[PDB]
Amino acid sequence: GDDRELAILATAENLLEDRPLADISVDDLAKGAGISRPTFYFYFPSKEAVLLTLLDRVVNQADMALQTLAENPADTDRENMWRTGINVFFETFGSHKAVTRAGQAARATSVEVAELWSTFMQKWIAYTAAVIDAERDRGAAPRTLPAHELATALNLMNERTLFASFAGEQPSVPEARVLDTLVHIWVTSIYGE
């Protein structure tokens, strides 16, 4: 079970580097995984379900990395604190660009992909707002915008900006500049009065 499922998922991630999900057949997935087509349908109903599982894996990888960071004591340097956090997403999604690209596109056509992304964005926004609230409570950040509203716009900026950078969209921030760009906007907007 585990082994043939993992092989299908690995094959899908590899083929999505070359082409979009529309141009990948179940035959391609079964062939890559060394199984028959009917055996593929035992593990997944569709190529779309495979992408959902890949995206779920990547999103939970980012979330579990963020939880690991949240568990350790807080970085005493506020800019570095936020940079290490944004970097979890930069490195996790940047290490899975094909799944990232395909998953964002699938939000349009898949309610399960749209709901997965929504769910995790709400969790990441809530956490961001809780950190901003803690910074205000300790007198390290000014009481300016509603923290949850600020957190929402900053998280949406990172969603759009990181995906544009990884896809090489025109326009985009160069990948080698995007972490510095986003940290600057987070720190100035969280700590600026």
Ligand X SMILES: COc1ccc(NC(=O)N2CCC(C)CC2)cc1
> Cβ of 174: how many Cβ atoms within 10 Å?
9
- 58: exposed, middle or buried (C-beta count within 10 Å: 0-12, 13-18, 19+)? middle
* 43 contacts ligand X (rule: CB under 6 A): no
Please name the residue that has the structure tokens 């179940």: 26
Residue 158 makes contact with ligand X by CB under 6 A = yes
* Distance of alpha carbon 81 from alpha carbon 70, whole angstroms: 10
Out of 15, 50, 51, 86, which residue is the one contacting ligand X (CB under 6 A)? 86
Residue ranges in 90-149 that form contacts with ligand X under rule CB under 6 A: 93, 124, 127-128, 131
Whichever of 88 and 182 has its CB closer to a copy of itself, that residue is 182
Q: How far apart are CA 32 and CA 122, in angstroms?
A: 36
Task: Choose the one of ligand X, a copy of itself, none that binds residue 128, judging by a C-beta under 5 to 8 angstroms depending on kind.
Answer: ligand X
Binding-residue pattern over the window 37 to 56 for a copy of itself, x denoting contact by CB under 8 A? --------------------
* DSSP structural state of residue 74: P
Binding-site member from 12, 47, 85, 102 for ligand X (CB under 6 A): 85
Contact between 183 and ligand X by CB under 6 A: the answer reads no
For the record, the structure tokens of 81 come out as 């604190």
Residue type, 61: Q
Q: In this structure, what token pair is assigned to residue 142? A: 């000014």
Supply the minimum distance, in Å, between the C-beta of residue 145 and ligand X. 16
Binding interface with ligand X (CB under 6 A): 85-86, 89, 93, 124, 127-128, 131, 155, 158-159, 162-163
